[model samples]
Target: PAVRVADLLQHINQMKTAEGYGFKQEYESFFRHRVKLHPMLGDYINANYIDGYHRSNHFIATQGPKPEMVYDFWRMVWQEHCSSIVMITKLVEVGRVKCSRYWPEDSDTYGDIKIMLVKTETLAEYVVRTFALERRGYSARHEVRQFHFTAWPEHGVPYHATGLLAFIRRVKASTPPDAGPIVIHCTGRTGCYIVLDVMLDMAECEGVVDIYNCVKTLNMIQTEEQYIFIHDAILEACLC
Candidate 1:
């Protein structure tokens, strides 16, 4: 047992050194192999299914839709039966285009899907948009909620986690009891926000948060700063 402990420590040290090394091949291969293509459009969409703490296929991790890809985005949403959408990045950041405004101010049609903006509510840190989705051939309408977090910047964590924690609470509350996985999109592919939200759920349900194992299970790594931010966020959630 003593010798096993020493080996574990050595392995931990090696993993620490490897945290920031050789990510190009690691992520590129994942994108190539695990990407979920649009059913009709084929390789036009960049998205992947991610399991959550309680269930497999609990979320769809995807990049923000480009202007040309918005229709495909809606296609996947309808195909997957997703009831919630989480957007973590702004449409424009620092005068640069971050994500396309895929939803409508009133009502719009994407391919055969029609999106009607029911209402929008602005909070301190996030905005919630209610949309009714209808397929031209389908007889029923599906209500989808978009929770867009606006406090976080393009390259960093928020100054505090209370708003984020509250935002997550609101998202969970709004989702249906038997709905499909949530659709989450961001401008970047790192998925820091996703990791934080998932780990927080782990802590709540399991009474422990294995942050390292969670990241490893997701086959991704967070920056040192982001790792500490997750810890702080979890601690703040505990205090709440």
Candidate 2:
């Protein structure tokens, strides 16, 4: 049976509220503090953190930060939040490998850290290589996977979704008997991110419904073409 878009959106909004999933005032405070610490990096982090209703831990980043900046970010993440790190390499740029300088020295830090070097042109390839390799390791892979999909603007959304779904399926397959959640990120922190968020919201609300309706509801909230790309991706997921 075909589900109505209006009903699907309303159901999602209700579930979002009913599950106590809306962004809380405390989240705003945390986001503000994060931004103040590192304007560019913090701003990007806060955007993804808040937009996903503060549920996602994975942070998709474009490029590695400067040595000192990376140290500060990791310091706070490790010492304070005790969060593990995952990196995404979307572009092939020749540079010194300085990320290790920023890794947490504390042996007590849980989970595994991974660096995924992926081509912007092929998300499917990226997923197959990065995720497939990381999942087989001993540790939890930090319970997070960062994705930098915007490094190749020319590739567009369908490619991104294909790559993303591959990664998601990989995680589901490789996840331990007890595993947690996942997150996805991009450069601007809004375009593809928002689209993905809306798709998840719709899927949670109207299970197995048409992807077109999900896209329509997403547009109602964030009017943009990224939703169109998201719709295309969801349709692909449906077919699979």
Candidate 3:
């Protein structure tokens, strides 16, 4: 049976009251973060904080935002003071909608917050969009970078690691260690895991690429071929 997207989204989005900071609770100790919604703004958006090789909240891992959650997604970005958004899938791919178009092509206001595209650059595999995020009453704004990786395959790995590694470097160069959580997405489970692993892979530049140090990735793919695709990509990354 094709998994019901609504049912799955419902599972993550349980009951919430207005005073609950607009976050969902998990029984698996659900591995989700409360998203803090600024105390000044309110919206029902939820995301998870996954540990990195060194830190616990090194990255923000989220499922692709639904149309209704797009505003909340941006709100999360502003509140978290995140420097980069690593999008692992396109808004539409393989005849399916994996994630929504959460950003403005020009400039748009979601609420008290206004987001403007200050610059854009297209690379071989990803396009970088820089946004100026500010509140309506405030005189200051944040410059946020969004990396849309075009080379990534849906529910799979890219054919080559050169472009993939290149994107990683660009993201690392812009996102400093103290800036805020870096947001990344993929298959609800495996996608976030792979994103974290990629960060772990980058950590190899400082040490060894131990595939097992601090991985929270599992159920990443259901088939043998897809798993093989990931394994091959990892090895290729080492050489690239």
Candidate 4:
């Protein structure tokens, strides 16, 4: 019993007028009825809970076409009370360039602490240069330890699940217990970036409901397809 698009639209209209009862309640009612009308619709609605908000403990950083976006993201990290920032990039050159751009300034509101940079490629150079005496002025010199591998989507590996699992494991191991929240980002803040964010959100919830809720919230201006790609990526991770 798959839900008809017209029926779904009708419920959406009704829910729009039922705001006094709260969006969650209206959605729940509509969802339950939809499932009854079209059994196949249950799969989509069942995962709706994944759309809600959950506090995260990690933060991700990367360069975009605009440098100011990096600053904007840092502001978000500070506002979110994240424990540490993790920068992942394809090349050490790019990673280093981005790191230097975002490192907190002395006059900045955030504390004097240095952020962590995770260089995925060319570990040895990062280890030597980041720790070398001459380069000690760089914040990473004190904050960053060694670099490790967390598979990237661009690598075209046969299985993304393995990469995702390895990423989660390594991130958990590296993250401090006292870190407040987490953030993950990529160049455009969509596509693979969205996928990773959705995967992390799903891992925190019992069903897809939270994912759905979060997708709606994050995509207040974005597209459903963008959110679904992230959802699918998380599902792929779970299968692995």
Please tell me which predicted candidate would have the highest TM-score against the true structure: 1
Best lDDT among the predictions, by candidate number? 1
What local distance difference test score does each model get? 0.72, 0.36, 0.62, 0.36
Candidate 3 to truth, TM? 0.72
Tens digits of lDDT, candidate 1, 1-240: 111221333433443465634333333334333446546643487778887777888888777788888988888888888889998777888888887799999999998999999999998789999999999889999888899988876677778878877888898888876888788886232466667677777766656666555655672544555555655666677653
Local accuracy of candidate 4 as per-residue lDDT tens digits, 1-240: 222222433433453475524335523432321111122221111110112133332333333324434434443444344443443444333244433334322223222233444332343212111211112233333233223233343324224344544554555566566654434433322333433554454454533324444433331313333333443445555442
Supply the global lDDT for candidate 3: 0.62
Query: What is the overall TM-score of model 2 with all chains considered together?
Result: 0.43
For 3-30, candidate 3 gives per-residue lDDT tens digits of 1222323322332344322232211222
lDDT at 80, model 1? 81
How many pairs of residues collide in each model?
Answer: 0, 0, 0, 28
Give the Å shift of residue 28 in candidate 1.
18
**What TM-score does model 1 achieve against the real structure?**
0.80
Q: Model 2: clashing residue pairs? A: none
* Regions of model 4 farther than 4 Å from truth: 1-83, 91-161, 183-186, 189-205, 219-226
Candidate 2 per-residue lDDT, tens place, 1-240, comes to 344444544533442484434323212222221322333333332322322322343332223554444433433342223222233334343453323333322222222333333322235344322221122354443322233332333323334566665544544354343333232221322334444544554555665444443233221223223434544455555542
Between candidates 2 and 4, which one is better according to TM-score?
2
RMSD of 3: 12.8
Clashing pairs in 3: none
lDDT measured at residue 21 in model 2 versus the true structure, 0 to 100: 43
